[PDB]
């Protein structure tokens, strides 16, 4: 229940890739679509393209999968100075030994070690019973490959019944005492305008 304008969203970090699916990056403000769900996190650079709608990979099936019919898109910028530490900021990490392929948009929270069946490891964390996660490094200096990239994935729904963010923007100036057409708020008409 607010208006959203990404015209001011042009001003951001120079590292800015804005590609979207199902809608061109210009016609959203005029549209009157329903609610939108966002979530964001900072990632090693190389796989910012490995995250996309519904393709294979190590990261796609474990923590986040993106539906193919993806109404919405990703916004990525560079936060290396916001993230990297001299000794390395050890704060980010991802699932590494999930015994399944995680589907798009389901809650996947767990902290117990992975177990490959076979023999009952029973929480020893030895062989064939590994603990996933295995955090990143975030070196103070590194190439764009492991550069922490702040990426937000945003998905807005449709079906037009729960009007949530919606449209009407781009107002126009006024005319008076002249035969003109008009659309004041959704109603169309023509004629002359007078002080009433």
């Amino acid at each position, epitope marked *: 229940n607010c208006v959203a304008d990404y015209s001011v969203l042009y001003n951001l970090a120079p590292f800015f890739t804005f590609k979207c699916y199902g809608v061109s990056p210009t016609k959203l403000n005029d549209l009157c679509f329903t609610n939108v769900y966002a979530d964001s996190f900072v990632i090693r650079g190389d796989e910012v393209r490995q995250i996309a709608p519904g393709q294979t990979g190590n990261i796609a099936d474990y923590n986040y999968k993106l539906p193919d019919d993806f109404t919405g898109c990703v916004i990525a910028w560079n936060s290396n100075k916001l993230d990297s*530490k001299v*000794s390395g900021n050890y704060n980010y990490l991802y699932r590494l030994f999930r015994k399944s392929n995680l589907k798009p948009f389901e809650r996947d*929270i*767990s*902290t117990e070690i992975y177990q490959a069946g076979n023999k009952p490891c029973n929480g020893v*964390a030895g062989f064939n019973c590994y*603990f996933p*996660l*295995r*955090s990143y490094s975030f070196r103070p200096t590194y190439g764009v490959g492991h550069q922490p990239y702040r990426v937000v994935v945003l998905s807005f729904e449709l079906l037009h019944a729960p009007a949530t963010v919606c449209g009407p923007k781009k107002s126009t100036n006024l005319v008076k005492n002249k035969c003109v057409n008009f659309n004041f708020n959704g109603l169309k008409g023509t004629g002359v305008l007078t002080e009433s």
Partner: antibody
Amino acid sequence: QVQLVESGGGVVQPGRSLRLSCAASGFTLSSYGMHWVRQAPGKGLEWVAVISYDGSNKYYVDSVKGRFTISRDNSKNTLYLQMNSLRAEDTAVYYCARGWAYWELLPDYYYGMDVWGQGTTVTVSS
Amino acid sequence: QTVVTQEPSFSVSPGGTVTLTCGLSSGSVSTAYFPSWYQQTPGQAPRTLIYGTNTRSSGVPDRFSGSILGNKAALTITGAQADDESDYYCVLYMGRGIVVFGGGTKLTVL
């Protein structure tokens, strides 16, 4: 000032109960997690009772499962550690440490124990 | 259940650099274990020193720094001082609130 003061220490006979009180000053209990640490003299500290900021779930150690209960009062920022089935080896110095807040988005296995008070010990002997 | 590997007590002259070690008996140590190093002055309240293996506590000098060494967590002390003689304890994290403490080391300063 941000402080956790433990009150209720003393001599409690074996097999009895006690509700150890923890009063917090300076900060809001509902916004941070707590850690209860048992520290016997001349030995190592040990983890007993921990509660999340929101009280959504309860975590303990195996030796204290179902024999110690920790409860909270967010209306007036108070903590009540209920002691049950006390034994002679429970005699240690207990510290309350403060866990990180949800105001900073931190991952799971929540990190804590950043600041703590003087602590208070218990005495269980007959 | 796992046990953290620690040494009972150290004896190092003031002004020097010493290493404190804590490792995992169940396997190699990764930074996901969240090693933490605290000093325990006997009979008093501990003071936060190291959390996250790479961050100090507020106001702590540049002397007590932690790190990772093979399958061991390493805490580095540069410029030992008479107050540094104290009991030291490590914390390792098993998911969703299992903090583990090892043997503890009495770092005495000669």
